[PDB]
Ligand binder design. Structure first.
Ligand code: MG
Ligand code: MG
Ligand code: MG
Ligand code: MG
Ligand code: MG
Ligand code: MG
Ligand code: MG
Ligand code: MG
Ligand code: MG
Ligand code: MG
Ligand code: MG
Ligand code: MG
Lengths: 251, 251, 251, 251
């Protein structure tokens, strides 16, 4: 329905799962997309699977890599013109309690999940402000940004940080009339090939004491809320949290 | 883009402002709509202004009127077939502190804003469960369901009640596999003819200490999040709060 | 330790369970207390069990009874001097989903849990403002004011209302320099003789998927946070939610 | 009133302002206290100002220094016996928007405000679990852990992280019956000599659009909620947020 007419989007971690579904729906709604990922083998195949290079390209990048962020925005503008939309979706997890998190685990996870979002959000504001683009920064901030999980200590830290840092950025962009919105999306458990690779994971996640709907979601569940937030339909939404979680946080 | 293909929606307080914009966008996305309002003069004109009777009709009703709710669902099903979608949007305000709220003011506001939402949500679950409709109940729950305002005491009570009652309903519908989702929408300040009728109101609401964007929203800002929530795009969203407020609650 | 030196407190539903523990600790900290309850047999015994009439008295009252509230404040002032402290603790529950809540059940529960808190808060502001009392209104607002429960629909409505209405009152009292604070306390599951009377209830409430500590609390757990909020120790706390829940809402 | 009978507390950033008031009230309530700070000149004077070495000592430490944390717990146990209580209060601020935060500023602030809290919380769980101490970890998590401020981007990130990381730790300690509680305290604006050193700061913070009480708090306002959380009075409170903010976040 051309809901993203003329938009130019960067999606980090766009080569798999949630990020790939966001990229797919963004292209279907008329956006030009640059997806990122660490593995050129995966990324080259992923871009080609979604569309032609006039619609979607791949840029190899680890979101923790500060200087690569500059190269990524330049490559996207060279391909598609000025960037309007950034989805900070790249993330990793550590399955440790706070008590059992090694400092190396802590720093590695924060480098991707927190520094990556900071670097992308900071650079995005510089590059997308004051251009009449209807710019939108969408930060993936998890149900683990609202509630704790005893075995996700560092992940919880990262997602709580993204949640409130995003409000700061939203406010500064609003008060300065930058034409940049910043919002967070908080997925509950989502079925991906990686969940499928973990025996018993989907069944545990689908128990009513975890997800009240009694099943987990699917990548397009997160793609559709991202289309809304990237579109001009959400021009009055900034500094807000959007939860799509099968009821996980309602109980 | 036919995002509400085959849906049949009731929108309370659908004859003006936010409700009328929700009705307009619902019809544009392929839903059949029954709007309600207290004033037959307003409602007859409003339905005709949006579309033909095959698309949209009006039913006169005060949401505080329990027995009229049954008549409303029957009229909608007679016109359009089984109801899939309920937007509990009808509301009133009292400009009083808790200290200065009369008991008559308290009961009148709660009858519309809280009993109306309860009556609609209860009846909606009975009528829309277990039919494969992809049913969705959307309760208007305000930024005043998140933060207090010293001059909106009864309104705050009503909107806090809608916020958490809606989570209860969401959970019961999820746990029982009813195929009914329940979510809340929380508008910030929105420009309507009624705001326009109050000298200085929009300017006060647009101060940066109130709305960081420095302007208020427009009825379509609430219509678009309602289209998402009424659509099957939001099939994994239940028990969630969706804020569209220009940054009001982010600071 | 005389933490409530000179305070004069009304505790609704003060004759049993949580309310009786709040009354007991208030008297131990030097407050003069008027407890209320519906049953003169229970209330007369309860006051005598805590202390002598110079320390604590009983006033028979249903918190839903608007005109009795005036009589209650007058009786307390006659016994002990001007009221400084109000704990709106009286409440009832209905074990019904929203879907299965009768209108009679809905209205009865809201009359106690919501009208009672409104009547007490409104009257308290009138009677306790501008007297240098360090006045404090503490509204019992439940974990069910934060999360839904599929079988507590009306209770959830009432507790969400108390949560946000209390912020309105807090703000108006702060902005007008009334020397009245308003805060909410949100108990998780608490062991009382009434829980003991329900076979299997404590075991269900103690499951790790409900209360992560693996046991439920005890009335003094709520008494101690109420002493803090009634005391001048909390003179900068207003409009805040205080949760004491064994981790229920943290997951 | 000996509310912290037998407790042994570490307070980071305990040599000034809020931390020094927490230390002062902890000693008055019968706790043995080790305060930390970066400056031996300040810390030696601060410990002596509160009490004698049998009551309170100073240990020089930057909370960002991982290996110093081990030395700090050993010194405290050598002086006073096993540590029961940790207040992670040390923090710094950067007055920059996300847009204008340098990477050096970002990393320095996160090293103190986030790594320091992680290091202290992790080590505290190892050292204070399974000893019958009634152990309590209290993490300073700010009103800036709830709302954004356009000029506190990195600070907001750090305080959001502390808020949700603390819930993870609370849950793991509860589920494993470690006899360790973890909670967060969220001060609003508090008058300290450092605020006094910034011309116009207190007046800006006291505007009704910032702090509804129309004045800022005082260090003892944070000390008293910390006494409650360190005491066995709060034995059912874990994973909770305690806000003391003059109404800042209620509007
Ligand atoms: Mg890849
Ligand atoms: Mg559970
Ligand atoms: Mg918000
Ligand atoms: Mg939960
Ligand atoms: Mg009308
Ligand atoms: Mg939710
Ligand atoms: Mg009684
Ligand atoms: Mg608050
Ligand atoms: Mg120092
Ligand atoms: Mg303001
Ligand atoms: Mg909690
Ligand atoms: Mg606010």
């Amino acid at each position: 329905s051309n809901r993203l007419d003329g938009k130019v989007a960067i999606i980090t971690g766009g080569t798999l799962g949630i990020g790939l579904a966001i990229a797919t729906k963004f292209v279907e709604e008329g956006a030009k997309v640059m997806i990122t990922g660490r593995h050129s083998d995966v990324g080259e195949k992923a871009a080609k699977s979604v569309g032609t290079p006039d619609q979607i390209q791949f840029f190899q990048h680890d979101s923790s890599d500060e200087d690569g962020w500059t190269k990524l925005f330049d490559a996207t503008e060279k391909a598609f013109g000025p960037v309007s939309t950034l989805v900070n979706n790249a993330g990793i997890a550590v399955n440790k309690s706070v008590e059992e998190t090694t400092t190396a685990e802590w720093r590695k996870l924060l480098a991707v999940n927190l520094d990556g979002v900071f670097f992308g959000t900071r650079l995005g504001i510089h590059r997308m402000k004051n251009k009449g683009l209807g710019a939108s920064i969408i930060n993936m901030s998890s149900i683990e940004g609202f509630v704790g999980d005893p075995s996700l200590g560092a992940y919880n830290a990262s997602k709580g940080a993204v949640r409130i840092m995003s409000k700061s950025a939203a406010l500064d962009c609003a008060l300065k009339d930058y034409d940049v919105r910043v919002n967070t999306v908080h997925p509950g458990y989502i079925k991906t090939p990686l969940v499928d690779d973990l025996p018993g994971a989907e069944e545990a996640m689908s128990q009513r004491t975890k997800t009240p709907m009694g099943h987990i979601g699917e990548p397009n569940d997160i793609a559709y809320i991202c289309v809304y937030l990237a579109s001009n339909e959400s021009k009055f939404a900034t500094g807000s949290e959007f939860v799509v979680d099968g009821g996980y946080t309602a109980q």
